[PDB]
């Protein structure tokens, strides 16, 4: 149906290319998934070469990830917080690649309580040396700390949730993190 033909597109100059052949399967491109965050659902699809290519549908949760530490968790999503293609996907709350989003952050705390155990927002004798050997490694970039206290970090998902099925993404850190915050204050 929704084909990807170079057949259509008039032409490089203008010459309205005549409809050579009825459009083919191998040219096709299916309906856009635009997956929400409202009760976890996935349908697969039989693509080229068989291939189960899972289409995410109202996907809740995805494993959003640190940089400094290098970790990700069974992390709940909250909402579509800013999408730099089209703002249409912000209000409808449709999740998409490179969309800025908010992360429940409780799993990012619970695991951080082990990793270092210094706590973010504001027992046993030999562990105290592993606790002491670790920690004071990463100080974290302020916005992430306040967002840790908010229970709502700023990720920027990088899976393709109509292709993949998985809604797995990436916690914003540093410059890009500093940038998308300015756009969030511009939009709000």
């Amino acid at each position: 149906g929704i084909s990807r033909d170079s057949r259509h597109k008039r032409a490089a100059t203008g010459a309205k290319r005549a409809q050579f052949r009825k459009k083919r399967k191998f040219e096709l491109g299916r309906q856009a998934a635009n997956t929400k965050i409202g009760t976890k659902r996935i349908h697969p699809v039989r693509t080229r070469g068989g291939n189960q290519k899972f289409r995410a549908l109202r996907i809740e949760t995805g494993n959003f990830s640190w940089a400094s530490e290098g970790v990700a968790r069974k992390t709940r999503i909250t909402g579509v917080v800013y999408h730099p293609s089209n703002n249409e996907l912000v209000r409808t709350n449709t999740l998409t690649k490179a969309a800025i989003v908010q992360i429940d952050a409780t799993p990012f705390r619970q695991w951080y309580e082990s990793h270092y155990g210094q706590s973010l927002g504001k027992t046993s004798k030999n562990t105290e040396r592993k606790w002491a050997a670790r920690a004071a490694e990463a100080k974290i970039e302020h916005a992430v700390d306040s967002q840790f206290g908010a229970g709502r970090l700023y990720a920027a998902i990088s899976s393709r949730p109509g292709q993949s099925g998985r809604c797995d993404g990436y916690i914003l850190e540093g410059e890009e993190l500093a940038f998308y915050l300015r756009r969030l204050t511009a939009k709000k």
Partner: protein, 155 residues
């Protein structure tokens, strides 16, 4: 031609899968990844010293030069980051046994490493399909100046 702003879209563009570590404290900050292109083409330092990201550059991108390494002069430069190379040639016509001077303009992407102007000759490598028409990528502005530094008559 445009140009300059680096990060100025609705999105903010990084070199994908490439990182500028906040924990680490180098002088550059930004790990400028770059590509050695091959086919005896030198990487111009304006790419590696510079700022702009560009998906569609050969040096600062995933674009891989291959196949036909065309050439020709540059006629049109007006659009954003692409160029139109005018690849003149002859066409033999046996029933006469002479030649047509024929034309074909070739649209070709610019990595802003190079400074391209109108009336400049330019080698240019085929690569991925960049766009609709642009299947080509500027690799070497041969007339870098072409009497640019020197006009200039009065002794």
């Amino acid at each position: 031609s445009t140009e300059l702003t680096v990060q100025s879209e609705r999105a903010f563009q990084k070199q994908p899968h490439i990182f500028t570590n906040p924990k680490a404290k180098a002088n550059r900050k930004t790990k400028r990844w770059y590509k050695n292109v091959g086919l005896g083409f030198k990487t111009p330092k304006t790419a590696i010293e510079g700022s702009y990201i560009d998906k569609k550059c050969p040096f600062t991108g995933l674009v891989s030069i291959r196949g036909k390494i065309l050439t020709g002069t540059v006629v049109s430069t007006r659009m954003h980051r692409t160029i139109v190379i005018r690849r003149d040639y002859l066409h033999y016509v046996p029933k006469y046994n002479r030649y047509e001077k024929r034309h074909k303009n070739v649209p070709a992407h610019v990595s802003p490493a190079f400074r391209v102007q109108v009336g400049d000759i330019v080698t240019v490598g085929q690569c991925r399909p960049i766009s609709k028409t642009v299947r080509f990528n500027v690799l070497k502005v041969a007339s870098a100046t072409g009497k640019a530094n020197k006009q200039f008559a009065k002794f």
